[PDB]
Symmetry: D2
């Protein structure tokens, strides 16, 4: 990724927790998109419906969060903290469902691990 390089060159600019969060949002978005599709292709797709939905929700929220986190927030009201908290909660929910399938589907194991890491990164960027 070029998150770190680009933050340093912004005219309103270092912030390690923010860089980690942005990087994880884009990684998690892709991973969740891929997991949704993999689950879709499984013989057992009917057992994976909720996992697919959560993965699609998570991909969408992660892209939004990572994009908003790439912008200057100002010092008055901004959505960044709220959005990162939403992302953390979405990643927590998606992790839980992927994790339940992790013994049966390797793609769900990987996605659960990425969601856990993205949750941690988003929650850490809020403090």
């Amino acid at each position: 990724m070029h998150v770190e390089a680009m933050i340093s060159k912004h005219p309103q600019a270092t912030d390690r927790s923010l860089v980690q969060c942005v990087e994880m949002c884009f990684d998690c978005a892709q991973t969740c998109a891929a997991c949704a599709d993999a689950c879709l292709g499984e013989d057992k797709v009917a057992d994976l419906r909720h996992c697919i939905r959560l993965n699609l929700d998570c991909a969408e929220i992660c892209v939004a969060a990572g994009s908003i986190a790439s912008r200057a927030a100002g010092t008055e009201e901004s959505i960044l903290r709220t959005m990162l908290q939403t992302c953390a909660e979405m990643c927590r929910m998606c992790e839980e469902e992927c994790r339940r399938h992790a013994g049966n589907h390797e793609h769900c194991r990987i996605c659960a691990d990425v969601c856990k890491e993205c949750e941690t990164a988003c929650r850490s960027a809020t403090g």
Copy 2:
């Protein structure tokens, strides 16, 4: 829009507040994208930087919210309420900034009005 028609035909299906919310999310997303671009093209773009950012944030959150709201949430944990609350807060913030420019820029007046309506619809879908 086809929100109402599609909800009624879902196998897990009426919900007027949900239909209004989805419709408003997509309307607001487009309107905010358009307002960001219009502000970008203004002679006075330098005075509109924060408005442009909020409009881009709002467009992104509205698309995410409207997409998530188009899916079955289940009866355990789901992100829907959290996401709709985030959308409401984003629309409130974006409304406030557009409104400040509404006397000078008609596109900001229209976008403030749409954001206000989307805020109301999202907050109403949470109750």
Copy 3:
């Protein structure tokens, strides 16, 4: 939608085919998201895997197209025509697959009809 109102107020601004295209892109994006989810919830989800994928692809392309079409393109090189042509082709593909399921699933009938209309609107905006 507020497409028409916002185009008229842009500082670089009428264009009926462009308004129709933008409106249809957002309508189709929502409809395809909803159809993907409805198909996901069907007893027969395993027969609908390709339809679900095409609907997700279509939702994503329609949002991108509708957002790009909401911006000033300039008079040198721009992506608008290329993107609208891609959207038209995606809508054609998605229509074809939804249509095949239209006898069995009302949500697929509606989505096929919306995709057809969005295809027409995008192709018309290119001429």
Copy 4:
């Protein structure tokens, strides 16, 4: 990223050009979002209007492309090639405009370089 890990675990699954393309799409999407915001914050924002628009267009197309490229396409008609070609053309256009500002704005230099690489990766995945 987890692109490679997730492709290998898909039930319909190696493809190096596809992995490189997906990775570059998400990297480029973030970079373009960041460049648009950085240009927005410049004293000279009024000279960067077209660059900002192209960066927003590019971010949107790159996310769509990277998401579609993360899904099984089948062996009949699919949008993948068309979408990757659109992404390549968008990245070419965005590169050209960023490059013109690269002497004045380091964020534009970095974004031009990422766009060039994403263009190459998308065009290579089409062959």
